[model samples]
Target: MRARLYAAFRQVGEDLFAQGLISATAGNFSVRTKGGFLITKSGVQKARLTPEDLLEVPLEGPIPEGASVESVVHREVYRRTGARALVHAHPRVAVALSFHLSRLRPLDLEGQHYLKEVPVLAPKTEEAALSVAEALREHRACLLRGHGAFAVGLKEAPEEALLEAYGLMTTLEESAQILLYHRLWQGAG
Candidate 1:
């Protein structure tokens, strides 16, 4: 059972990287386990991950044995938001804008209706999880400083939730790019 979950998550990681949403080991994924979750191990490249490359940890208590380095962030997000699946990806355009923009707020519109407001979470630490949860409490996504973006969902199936979250992120990124290009062209004219 655990092996099947690990394989699924490994596939999730591979798909994200293959689809260009993340690069190398710059991203991680986690899915709700019976009590906690199974997450990709730190420093393991998503493209080369096997089932053994993933780790499991309890969600409600102290970190379980062999937890991922980012387990705190994942566990906290799940505990606070009740999200069954989570994905952290270092998307280039999103990260680039996060550094230049003071506050990474989502622009609500036709294309971004799925996102209410994607706030930027402060630096990661023991307390950072709570802060991130608070900032993104009302939304389904948040951008992290100098790192990447976090996405969440509450669907019963991990794969379904992940697909929805990934779609939202892609929409957000593409919409932002389109707006940016329009601005550039308008300024040139």
Candidate 2:
């Protein structure tokens, strides 16, 4: 189980990096465990994550020294929602769209079906953690205004949960790209 969990993190990390969802040392990911969750260490490139980059953080306690800066947010989401895994990524289009819109309403069929809309919020304030978690309780993904997206996977299996979260992140990005093009086309006409 432990080995498979590590493998899941590597595979998802590679995919997220290759797809440009996360830049070098920019985003974070975690999977829930019995008493806590395992998250990536700070300052490690998502694409090149090794076992050493992983750290265990309890659901409630002093966060480990090297855990991602977003570790507290991840824990809040776990406590508030049924997410088995979480993926936070700085997808270019989605983050950009978040700046202008309070919510991203997908026009594409797949995104419309899976993630009707993603709530956008500012991450700089004290309530950002609770706000993000609350938004995600009703939506599969939420965007941090001018920042990035947090996607949750509620599957029972860890691998599936990670993939589900990754999928939502990509879908959110794809929908943002389409929306941008649509708006540009309207403006040009």
Per-candidate TM-scores read 0.84, 0.95
Which candidate number would show the highest lDDT if scored against the true structure?
A: 2
Report the lDDT tens digits of candidate 1 across residue range 26-131: 7777877787777877777888888778767887686765556778888887777777777777766777777776555455474557666566765747787787
| Runs with alpha carbons beyond 4 Å of true place in candidate 2 | 123-126
Writing each residue's lDDT as its tens digit, candidate 2 over 75-112 gives 98888888789999998998898889989999999999
RMSD of 1: 2.6
Task: List the global CA lDDT of all models.
Answer: 0.71, 0.88
Off by over 4 Å in 1: 1-8, 61-66, 102-110
> Candidate 1: how many backbone clashes?
0
Candidate 2: worst-modelled 10 consecutive residues by lDDT? 120-129
Candidate 1, residue 72: Cα displacement in angstroms equals 1.0
